[PDB]
Amino acid sequence: QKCQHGQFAANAWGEWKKIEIPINVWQENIRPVIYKSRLYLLWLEQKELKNESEDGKIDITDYILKLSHIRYDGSWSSPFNFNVTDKIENLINKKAS
Amino acid sequence: AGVSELAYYPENYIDPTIRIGQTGMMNNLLQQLSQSQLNIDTVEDSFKNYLTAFEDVANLQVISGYHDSINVNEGLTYLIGYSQTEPRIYYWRNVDHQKCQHGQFAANAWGEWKKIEIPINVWQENIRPVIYKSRLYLLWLEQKELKNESEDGKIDITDYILKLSHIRYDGSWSSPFNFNVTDKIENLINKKASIGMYCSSDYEKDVIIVYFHEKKDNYSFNSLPAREGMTINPDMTLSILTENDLDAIVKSTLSELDTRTEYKVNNQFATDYLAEYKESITTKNKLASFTGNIFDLSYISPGNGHINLTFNPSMEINFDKNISFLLKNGSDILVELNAEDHVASKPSHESDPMVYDFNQVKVDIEGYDIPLVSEFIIKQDIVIESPIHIKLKSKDTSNVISLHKMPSGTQYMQIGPYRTRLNTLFSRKLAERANIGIDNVLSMETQNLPEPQLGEGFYATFKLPPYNKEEHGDERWFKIHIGNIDGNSARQPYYEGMLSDIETTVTLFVPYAKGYYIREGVRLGVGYKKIIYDKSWESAFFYFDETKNQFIFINDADHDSGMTQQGIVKNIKKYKGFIHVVVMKNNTEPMDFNGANAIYFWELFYYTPM
Amino acid sequence: LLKNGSDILVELNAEDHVASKPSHESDPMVYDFNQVKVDIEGYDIPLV
Amino acid sequence: SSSVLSTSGTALHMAAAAADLVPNIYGFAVGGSRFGALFNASAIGIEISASATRIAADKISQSEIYRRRRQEWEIQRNNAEAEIKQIDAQLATLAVR
């Protein structure tokens, strides 16, 4: 609303605010989302555990979606875990970003 | 004069700081606010910090409860709710049924949510509370799944463990007592079904009954579900439960078991009756104390509504036509005994206490509440009264508290025709006001925000005639009764009001559950001190039109060939007793400041700015 | 009356096209005119 | 600020406990996870809560001792004002003498 013609004033920019929940993204797939005028935060984590051998070759990779939203006092919620590794492996067997 | 002034003008004595019953968020706000210097930024940060805790308390969801007494309308329920966090943190609150004067709880009955401090990791939300020796015990199961998920050395070790914790007097929680139960749970799990959990406290025997059952859609009293029995002593040592006693227990309380679709609340376990009585009662005359007593009480229910009492009364006079036993009903003399007649081994005077031990007293009474009175009469004027109250456990579906969860997010507890909201969606609407401004959350718009209506339901406004000492009678009230809800299709006292002058209306919420509405749907008639209504279409018959997905007033006009839920009936009259009855077409019922979270709403909107 | 900024799109009355006109015995008088259908074009439609 | 900020770590300790309950190891050893992590996080949240209300008590104590210092200064100011009035009236009676 502050950019009167294409170009923002310095009034429009807010301060950087550090989020406190530690986040370990896989390949930087992390987006914010304003939901019910509340800042929700979404990203994915991966857990690659590869044996890298032949006798008992174990290749367990787990992709998990995490969700956190801010509170009124600036604190961040606990991350809500969602197992999504089946859909991500469906998108990953067809080899694409 | 100070006490009488506190009665008459309480406005002089209320301070906005302290209050008997203020909550932990209020006290934390007061700690955050008590400085010598209070800036606008400081008080707004403290208010946001209070708003965070208010949001976290409003975002609770009830799992399960435990009504304390046998009958619903007597004891007090203990509800358990959880927070919306990944380390899911559980709470408990307490609501009394002595305060609901007619079906609906006051805000006095609801207690504060109290956070339990022992961290609990339930498997599939099988967690029940249990009041044992008037102490809040808490039961749940944990699982430990360890699967290799391979072929070479496929290891599948799963361990199910029952944990028990009870509260202390200072609010702290005990250490959880572990119980390996994984063999019984794997027995119930190899037969592939959902695992239920019954947790209650016997009072005749002093143990707690825990059996897990499979979940059917209906338990038909003869097709018993697959069950695994267990029992815990007063000490946390575990006792075994044989299958015959287990089948007796399941036959006793199949009705309080949770099905696959609807969650129940376990009451206090009781087989047929409960004998509320004391053993020895003293008198202490200045001649001699007497202390007559009843020693070995035993009662066997031969059928449904009957009993076979058996006990051995005695008198213990310590320092003929004399001392006599008398067992009476409220007016019926059932058993009358004497000292010279039918007393085996009359005691000698060489004993300083004279114990008599009359005989074994047998009687057969019928009924559901038997307030017997045992009297030990001496005269020549000394009577020892000893009451015995025997109460039947009613096995109706109305004697089971049912709680539900609407898909809109609300969560109501339903006791028969009555429903009571336990949750709120206020925190989901609060953030849009809060990020705009602190003026906006304390606006009246935030208080006039609507909420869902506890199931399907509908409303109806009943306009009533003036009182004129005829067509009503003398006592000047009205009892809006109800019929055809459950399998019971008869007159139930739904709502009562006092009849008033020229015009009075009342909006009543009437639910719907699609297993309800037996014949022609729900009827709704008036009561009076004179002859009541509801005789062959005098009442207001409603039914749910399944086609148009709406509720139809059927008794509108004097209709001919009118459609009910059964079908088309021929001759329909008009509703009588009322003046105007109509459907109220999606009422709002905004926030319920006399509800369950009434204390939190009042603390947010009045006590905090004060 | 449903209007655009200047176009009168849907104009309704109480005597005309109101199904089940309410009685005076009801203290709120709910009317429930009919189902109003209209077809507008454009990207910003500030209807009134 | 210390009393407010110290209470924001219980959610993180609970999140650490919830994250360290899933089994770490896989394969021929099935999995190792500390089971008492939730109890340890609840105990350490209780301890950090006790520290937070301790420092809240220190804060309110400092506020009250500042208030008492101001009240004592008010006493001294009233005494000195009475003294300067008395010496002024003594100057008056000295002029009369």
Added chain:
Amino acid sequence: SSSVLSTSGTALHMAAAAADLVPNIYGFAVGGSRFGALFNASAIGIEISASATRIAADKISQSEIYRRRRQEWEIQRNNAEAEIKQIDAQLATLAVR
């Protein structure tokens, strides 16, 4: 409240120790469990008990210093009451003179 609430964590630490004594791992590796968890929980309960009685000592010290402040105010009040009586009797002898 701090002195009461700080002592409620020993049961949780003992429960963590009792929960972390069963073997975590299974399968071809038989099981790993820290054996000194009970000793560590007893030591940390002793330390939190020492902190609780320390802050109880601070609480009773604050109560006694408030009592001494009140007693000193009582001294000052009695001195000022004697002073106002003395100046009133001096006003009487000035009227006589």
